[PDB]
């Protein structure tokens, strides 16, 4: 009977860690930003609107220029967009319409994205014989792809519905590490500033922080009660926040193990869709599913201002590495720049 | 501005083939096809004739496209919003599994998955077609078996007639809209026609409803 | 690739061709850059992706026709009164327009043809010394700053090696093109611009010209030899 003595052993441990978590919280979040003035009302205007996209939108991404854009729908089309004159530098027919993903290189010469095909497409948008065409097609995972970010102009990663998180190396095609122990269909991932590490949540209601160089497991946080559908980093890199079904959201710090504050108000019961932090990490910026855009003031976890622009949900959200614009894509196929 | 004025007739190159492509697009009509895996979906997609399977036929000047989803093995509610606006669900449900097992017998899986199907808060009005296949192997398997297996609460001849009546009302009695959706049932063989003319028939009660929607009268 | 037209007719009129290969041709602007024998470039004409808006030089705006297939891949050029200046090698020149791209990238090898207000482009040196591995800087003035309020300065360098086509070096003034080494290095201040070139090679001599996108009636700047 040695399951049931390590189920024990599993319990006692996880009871451990438990005890190991309490211990350090030596107090909150919100006591100590308690002194810090608030922000105020925030007030972002429509600055721009981007017409063209004719079915629901379900991501976009930023260039490293924090002008270019690229965005994903279900008519089959990725569009990249000049966000300063509204122009469309490329239009892009995906081979499967089912799109859930997107993904802009650092470098800009590529483009990835993915969905209920269960394959990432690589396209070259810097091609020398005239028009983007697709680069590499990256099949391996068993489930819908999720998400997926460029680590470097060779290497991404993908997080799929099959709990697995994979890294590929685009030259050859094969999957070089595999990210396992999720128990439900991972949702979304984040990669560090540094980018040697990355966040995923999960349907099972926890996020992992995993090694990108060794391929294991480093911390599991939980505390959400549904699933995880939104994940990002913040700007410092030693945290992150989460967005689950459950009309909440979390922030946790990778050197503390626990969550540190709660974005949640009784008027909202509605799942969030994508989170986002802005330049500085002091707003974080939340997409739900009531048409509106939420922005909640990190440290004191305070409502500050909502982007309510959009007339279906919104799927997508990002802010510029400049930090001087937010790009809110939503169901009803149009994509506005606020402030 | 004589490069950006090049740049903006570029845009305006890319916008109509956009809407060029838009206008072949909201002229097809989308199903999405679902079942057990067993339940017969392969034969009925040759009748109309991993990851997600696109199927292409054409019937009556109308162009269908039918998605199969049965490779996926995942939760499903995390992309079952993908296929809101769909004009039609094809449901395949095997009526020769209703004493087979996966413990729990195959007929009740189907159960649990129509139901959840149906009153899925994205589909609240969007026809549901079931199609009842593997009807000849349920005409010789109900004459040395009864459905009692099954249905224990089942009182009636162990007769094609009445025993296949007897699922058919069972599976639509989960519809809990009633006033919002309807569900068409059709029986199924294995070497059988005029199939995509009843999911012809069915596309154009959506459709001339949804014509109702934009007039107002409906 | 691409090449084709005519080579000697006297007096009336004659047609020029040029045949488009396995770059997407549908998506690119042509133009028509001509040279004479022993003078720089010059602009001929220009027409845009689709067919759409059509420019003509000031000298050649009524005798001449500029038309494309983009079926076959085909950029033609008619010409119907030909006097005796419209004696030149005439170069076929693709060029493609949006956010970050490069325009006159790729020059056509080009065909000879015998017959038997606008923006001044100085380049006033005309020979330096050919002393290898030196820093030669060339240097460029323009009749007025170039400088758009979106930010770029449209200035482009070109360089024409002894016996081929111009080879697009630099695009905007700061620019690299592809395929070009590191060495040559573009600045400018809106109205007077330098080209630097590093470490001098065998492959770099020739004629350096410049150009201008600002204004759609573009000049060259009649070259700087080595």
């Known amino acids: 009977s040695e399951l049931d003595q390590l189920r024990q052993e599993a319990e006692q441990l996880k009871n451990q860690i438990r005890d190991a978590r309490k211990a350090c919280a030596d107090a909150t979040l919100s006591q100590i930003t308690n002194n810090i003035d608030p922000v105020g009302r925030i007030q972002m205007r429509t600055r721009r609107t981007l017409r063209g996209h004719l079915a629901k939108i379900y991501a976009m991404h930023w260039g490293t220029d924090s002008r270019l854009l690229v965005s994903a729908s279900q008519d089959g089309k990725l569009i990249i967009w000049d966000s300063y004159t509204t122009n469309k530098v490329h239009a892009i027919p995906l081979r499967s319409s089912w799109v859930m993903t997107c993904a802009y290189a650092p470098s800009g010469n590529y483009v990835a994205c993915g969905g209920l095909d269960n394959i990432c497409s690589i396209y070259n948008l810097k091609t020398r014989e005239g028009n983007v065409r697709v680069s590499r097609e990256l099949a391996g995972h068993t489930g819908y792809l999720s998400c997926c970010r460029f680590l470097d102009d060779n290497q991404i990663v993908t997080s799929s519905g099959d709990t697995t998180c994979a890294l590929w190396d685009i030259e050859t095609g094969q999957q070089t590490t595999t990210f396992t122990g999720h128990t439900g269909d991972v949702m979304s991932l984040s990669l560090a500033p540094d980018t040697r590490l990355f966040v995923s949540g999960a349907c099972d209601a926890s996020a992992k922080l995993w090694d990108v160089r060794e391929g294991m497991c480093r911390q599991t946080f939980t505390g959400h009660e549904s699933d995880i559908n939104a994940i990002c980093f913040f700007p410092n890199g030693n945290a992150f926040a989460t967005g689950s079904d459950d009309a909440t959201c979390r922030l946790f710090d990778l050197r503390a193990d626990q969550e540190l504050m709660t974005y949640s108000h009784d008027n909202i019961i509605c799942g969030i869709t994508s989170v986002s932090f802005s330049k500085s990490g002091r707003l974080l910026l939340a997409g739900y599913d009531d048409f509106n855009c939420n922005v909640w003031d990190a440290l004191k976890a305070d409502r500050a201002g909502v982007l309510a622009g959009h007339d279906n949900r919104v799927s997508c959200l990002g802010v510029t590495d400049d930090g001087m614009a937010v790009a809110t894509g939503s169901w009803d196929s149009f994509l506005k720049i606020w402030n | 501005s004589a490069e950006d004025k090049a740049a903006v007739e570029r845009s305006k190159m890319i916008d109509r083939n956009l809407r060029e492509d838009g206008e072949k697009a909201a002229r097809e009509v989308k199903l999405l096809l679902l079942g057990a895996g067993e339940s017969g979906k392969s034969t009925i997609v040759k009748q109309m004739k991993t990851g997600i399977v696109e199927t292409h036929f054409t019937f009556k000047d109308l162009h269908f496209k039918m998605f199969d989803v049965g490779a996926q093995r995942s939760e499903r509610k995390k992309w079952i919003h993908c296929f809101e606006g769909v004009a039609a669900i094809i449901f395949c449900v095997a009526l020769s599994d209703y004493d087979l097992v996966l413990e729990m017998n195959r007929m009740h899986e189907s159960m649990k998955l129509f139901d959840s199907i149906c009153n899925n808060k994205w589909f609240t009005d969007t026809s549901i077609i079931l199609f009842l296949n593997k009807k000849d192997l349920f005409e010789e398997k109900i004459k040395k078996s009864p459905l009692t297996i099954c249905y224990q609460e089942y009182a009636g001849s162990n007769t094609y007639e009445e025993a296949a009546a007897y699922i058919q009302c069972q599976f639509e009695d989960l519809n809990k809209r009633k006033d919002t959706k309807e569900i068409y049932t059709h029986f199924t063989c294995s070497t059988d026609t005029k199939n995509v003319q009843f999911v012809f028939d069915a596309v154009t009660d959506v459709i001339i409803k949804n014509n109702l929607k934009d007039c107002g009268l409906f | 690739v691409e090449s084709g037209g005519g080579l000697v007719q006297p007096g009336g009129s004659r047609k020029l061709s040029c045949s488009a290969s396995?770059?997407?041709?549908?998506?690119?602007?042509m133009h028509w850059v001509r040279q004479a024998p022993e003078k720089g470039l010059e602009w001929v004409a220009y027409?845009?992706?689709?067919?759409?808006?059509?420019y003509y030089a000031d000298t050649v705006k009524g005798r001449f026709t500029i038309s494309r297939d983009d079926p076959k891949n085909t950029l033609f050029l008619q010409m119907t009164s030909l006097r005796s200046e419209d004696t030149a090698m005439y170069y076929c020149?693709?060029?493609?327009?949006?956010?970050?791209?490069?325009?006159?990238?790729?020059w056509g090898q080009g065909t000879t043809l015998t017959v038997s207000s606008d923006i001044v482009m100085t380049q006033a040196t005309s020979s330096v010394p050919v002393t290898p591995g030196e820093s030669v800087s060339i240097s460029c003035r323009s009749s007025?700053?170039?400088?758009?309020?979106?930010?770029?300065?449209?200035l482009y360098w070109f360089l024409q090696r002894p016996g081929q086509s111009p080879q697009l070096l630099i695009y905007?003034?700061?620019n690299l093109a592809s395929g070009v080494p590191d060495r040559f290095s573009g600045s400018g201040s809106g109205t007077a611009f330098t080209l630097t070139i590093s470490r001098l090679e065998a492959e770099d001599v020739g004629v350096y010209y410049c150009?201008?996108?600002?204004?759609?009636?573009?000049?060259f700047g009649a070259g700087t030899k080595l």
């Open positions: 905007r003034m700061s």
């Open positions: 027409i845009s992706s689709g067919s759409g808006t059509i």
């Open positions: 150009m201008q996108h600002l204004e759609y009636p573009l000049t």
């Open positions: 007025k700053s170039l400088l758009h309020s979106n930010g770029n300065t449209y």
């Open positions: 020149v693709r060029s493609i327009y949006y956010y970050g791209s490069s325009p006159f990238d790729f």
């Open positions: 396995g770059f997407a041709f549908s998506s690119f602007g």
